Amino acid sequence: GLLSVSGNEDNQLTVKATVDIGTEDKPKLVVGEAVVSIRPNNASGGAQA
Amino acid sequence: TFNDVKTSLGITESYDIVNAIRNSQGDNFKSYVPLATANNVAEVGAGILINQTVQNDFITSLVDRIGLVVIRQVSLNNPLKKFKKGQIPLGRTIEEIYTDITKEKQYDAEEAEQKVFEREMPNVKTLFHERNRQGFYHQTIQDDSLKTAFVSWGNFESFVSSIINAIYNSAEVDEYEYMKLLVDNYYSKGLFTTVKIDEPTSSTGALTEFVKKMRATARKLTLPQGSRDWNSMAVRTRSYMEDLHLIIDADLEAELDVDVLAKAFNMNRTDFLGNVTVIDGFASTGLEAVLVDKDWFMVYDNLHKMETVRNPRGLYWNYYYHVWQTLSVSRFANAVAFVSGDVPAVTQVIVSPNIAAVKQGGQQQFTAYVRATNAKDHKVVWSVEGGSTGTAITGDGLLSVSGNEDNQLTVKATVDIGTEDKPKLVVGEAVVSIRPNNASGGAQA
Amino acid sequence: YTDITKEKQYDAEEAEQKVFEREMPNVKTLFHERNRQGFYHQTIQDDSLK
Amino acid sequence: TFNDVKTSLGITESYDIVNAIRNSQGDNFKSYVPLATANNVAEVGAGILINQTVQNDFITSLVDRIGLVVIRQVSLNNPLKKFKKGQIPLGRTIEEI
Amino acid sequence: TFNDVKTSLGITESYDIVNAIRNSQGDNFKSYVPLATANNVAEVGAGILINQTVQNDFITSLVDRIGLVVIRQVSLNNPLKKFKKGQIPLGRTIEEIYTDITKEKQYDAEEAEQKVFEREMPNVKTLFHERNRQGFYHQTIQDDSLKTAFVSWGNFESFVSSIINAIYNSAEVDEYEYMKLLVDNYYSKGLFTTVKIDEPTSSTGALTEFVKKMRATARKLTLPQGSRDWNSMAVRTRSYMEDLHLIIDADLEAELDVDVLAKAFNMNRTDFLGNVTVIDGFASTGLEAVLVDKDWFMVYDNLHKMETVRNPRGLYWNYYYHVWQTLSVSRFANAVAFVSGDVPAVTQVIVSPNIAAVKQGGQQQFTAYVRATNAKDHKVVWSVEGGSTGTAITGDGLLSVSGNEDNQLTVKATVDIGTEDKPKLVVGEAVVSIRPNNASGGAQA
Amino acid sequence: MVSFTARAKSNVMAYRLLAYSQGDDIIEISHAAENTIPDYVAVKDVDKGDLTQVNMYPLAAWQVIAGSDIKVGDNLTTGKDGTAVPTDDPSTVFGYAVEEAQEGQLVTLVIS
Amino acid sequence: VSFTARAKSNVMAYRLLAYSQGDDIIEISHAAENTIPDYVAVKDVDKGDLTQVNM
Amino acid sequence: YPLAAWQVIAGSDIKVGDNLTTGKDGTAVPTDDPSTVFGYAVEEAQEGQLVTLVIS
């Protein structure tokens, strides 16, 4: 559940918490949903280490 | 700051009631069919998570506004708060002192000729407790920024206070947890006078028997004459019925409320199993219920204050609710554990003189109380341990110190349970300070 | 609806640097809106009733 | 006047709750895991039999003191007390008629 | 807690008085035999480093409690404080200006004929002093933890107050030490005029000779006509007995009192002249006494603030006693040192007018004052460094400056101590700024 | 940390394992090839012609996209698209999982 | 950072350790002879005792 | 303090991406023979200038 946003994400994100119940032949996905507003910052970045 | 939010956000519908209503035909949902605005109610019946700005009907350019802000001033009090014993501003250690009864002597006035000034030491025991909790509740309140969310100062201030109240709530929640910790602690140490019960969930009969055991116990703990049992200090004590507090693990309460037709079904007060409190599980196994005196809790407040600080760079305040407490268990008080399933034959042996001081060449009778669960006879093996001189203890607990013992002695009361291939030694322990005297000696007779 | 805050251990040494540490409160919200709007039309034939 | 007293003096633990808590994983004892000072509470939760002098934090040379003494004024009344019929200062024999 | 602490924790027992008494026969310790509790007094009365728990004599369960807390308030003082020169709120540099005497010339109108307007510079010397100390005292007060150590507000408050007082004591101690530092510093730089003595702390002759030299020196320091020999600026000056202060120590004081003043009929003929004080000794090896003018010290206050701040999270106060001050020494003031240890033949050479600013193609006269502690001639060697060539000193301090310089110049004067394989050099220096000479030429004949 | 400038040369995606090469007076970066040991991890999307930076620091663990299901303690190597996948060939191991991850989820890793 | 380890068999302080896996949680034991160890014990850890690895 | 990158005086001219080894006086110089490689430069540097590159 730790969300990590890229250094250049420009769009609204949806976070889902899916629990698969039933069987693999007809999976049932119970989904919790949340939304994330992205905040600009002009932080430096690219690659690390 | 969102541009696309669905009203179904996070909602897994089992069915669409709007669809169900319009597709009904004199059956289920029939009475909703005439509800002129049911569709609206159905759409936002659960409210919405994100307030998507809605335009006003009649004039689309006007915006519907927030007509009401509800500050939910909800408290979360510690269900065990009633056991707080007050506070201690200065110092750290608490010394409990419990005196006890004295044996009756026969009124023989002839013996009284010489026995005036006879010494009779009182049965005084002690127990110490110390401040052991010390935490705090850090909380930032981003002042000034919040002023854009509220229109009225009344709402603004109400909100801020609810944050502070939330801090207080968290303190209460944690106290609750620490008090449960004390129960499980005391339990893990085998210091409860345990009672072996059969897991109620396995049978209504077992469940019923459990209640009888609790009831019998509850009575025993309140017998005016006292009984030594029920406490790990083996001191004679009683309890008043209103002092009893039965702690229920979980659903067990309900299970008894309904399954035990002959007890729980016609009660809700002190008279029946004492006072009853309910928790959300002991989570320590065995324990399904705990019965203790109101004086069993040594909860004292040592520090309660909120410090604050204003950041000037960032417009916010930090709050530091500091909570220091003495959290402990008053051994001396009555305390019973209702432990289901497999238990030890003997939970714990109690040596009565926990702290003894015996002279070189002097003696000290010790008494062992074997807290057995199987109600069978057990044998106590008395032994001296440590020390200098090989001095020992009789087979009945009479300690005899040599005329030249120079070291601290340990007195043990061992009860061997299990079998000879894997003996289990339940041991009661006591210590003896040796008192010098320069008494003459060597050999006798 | 505000909510509880996690207890932190009173370590005064850590406190040397952690003053002004930010701790956002667990605040959640929920919105409700006027959704019913109907009326009860009723004729009373006055005078005739007399 | 002792020079070596264990906090476990006379205590046969069925399990070590401190160990149990740190070795828990979202199961039993889960709610104790966040308790910032649980270890202290677990150590002296039952109190101690012998007051081993404890030094003050911040200044080791200072000694923590006893801030409270509790005198347990507990009575043990005769449950049958209500049947006392009074007293007889003089004489010895009672004649019921 | 420290568990098994012994009463002997910091004891280096020399003969065990308990046994000395125990087995005493005709020996003087026999006087303690009649005592009933001598063993307990002998065992503990020396003091207890670590408080170990003691149970009550009668009830082993009860713990004996402390019925008296003593806050030992102490105040320390800087004896040298009286030499402080006051306070300077603003600015920083302290300038000390001194006009020296001149040199007699011989009357002769044949020369005067031409030299009517020729200029003759005043012999002015200048010193500057800078702020040196800017340190501060830092003290944390952990109030709420202290509250567990004290059970009375009287003791609590007394204790905390004491700590703050200790901060001020800290300052007094260090100020004292800093002024001593100035003495050992100035000494380490060879700036005291050295007087050779022989360990007052020895024979009465050593003491006596010391006294003689002291009184004699004091006389010299106050002679009406003045002298250059007591200064690091080597300027002609004079001081009074009211200015003179003898620093020394307690050892000397006692020696004087007992072997001299006690016998003297006319005490004023052997006591020390001028004002006399006592310090705890000097750190510099061989330095026995220092005799200086009251204006030798150049100590000024720059800042004395105590800031206080609360840590709301850690629950404590931080006290910041900022002590800023100027710590320096006047080299114009008279200053001598009485040294018992072995010293250099020359401890310091003072050179010229110091700050010079000779114009390109010019000429200037430098000089030297050799502090010949061991009374030898000491030839002075001169040198010029920094420039190319055509610039040099004749050997008599007369500097001839070339037709073009550049670099800032330094002139040197030196004395060789030891042997050619151990050529220790005492070197005096002076700097010369070169004023541009606009005279033209380039190639000549 | 020690930062330096590097240019993507092939649509760098966040949380992917990265490799690098010597380019036109600049270090160029891209997703690490399958079955090897990566040098850097992306934490921002950087397109084929985009110029960015690299923050140097001996990180204890990386958070990368799982290329397949991963069990706690599994030794990991590069997979398709620079994702991390379970392996057993030491020479391609660059770290190991300390937590469970399903394909497409982030998996924390400890470098070796 | 850190993570939970389940030990494996009587870890001693200052000894070189190596990781493995079993039921779930990473198992820690003394590193085998003649190889490269993964971690250094800071304290003694019992056979099946959970603890932390301070990365 | 395990550094991932160093700043070393260039013993010659170094281009970005060049593998580096020890040179005269312990300076960093370009190489091509794995074994001598201790690090790769991340920036161009002229002789006498510091060059910063990752270890590896």
UniProtKB/Swiss-Prot annotation, chain A:
It is found in: Virion. Assembles to form a prolate capsid shell of about 54 nm in length and 45 nm in width, with a T=3, Q=5 symmetry. Homohexamer. Homopentamer. The prolate capsid is composed of pentamers and hexamers of the capsid protein. Belongs to the phi29likevirus major capsid protein family. This is Major capsid protein. It comes from Bacillus phage phi29. The chain holds residues 400 to 448 of 448 of the full protein.
Swiss-Prot record, chains B, E:
Homohexamer. Homopentamer. The prolate capsid is composed of pentamers and hexamers of the capsid protein. Residues 345-424 form the BIG2 domain. The lineage of its organism: Viruses, Duplodnaviria, Heunggongvirae, Uroviricota, Caudoviricetes. Assembles to form a prolate capsid shell of about 54 nm in length and 45 nm in width, with a T=3, Q=5 symmetry. Belongs to the phi29likevirus major capsid protein family. One of its GO terms (cellular component) is viral procapsid. It is found in: Virion. It comes from the Viruses. Residues 104-124 form a coiled coil. Pfam families: Big_2. Keywords: Capsid protein, Coiled coil, Late protein, T=3 icosahedral capsid protein, Virion. This is Major capsid protein. SMART domains: BID_2. The keyword Isomerase does not apply. Its main location: virion. InterPro entries: Big_2.
Curated annotation (Swiss-Prot), chain H:
It is found in: Virion. It comes from the Viruses. Belongs to the phi29likevirus major capsid fiber protein family. Protein that forms the 55 capsid fibers. These fibers are not always present and may have been lost in some lab strains. They may enhance the attachment of the virions onto the host cell wall. Homotrimer. Forms a super helix coiled coil in the homotrimer. This is Capsid fiber protein. It comes from Bacillus phage phi29. The lineage of its organism: Viruses, Duplodnaviria, Heunggongvirae, Uroviricota, Caudoviricetes. The gene is 8.5. The chain holds residues 58 to 113 of 280 of the full protein.
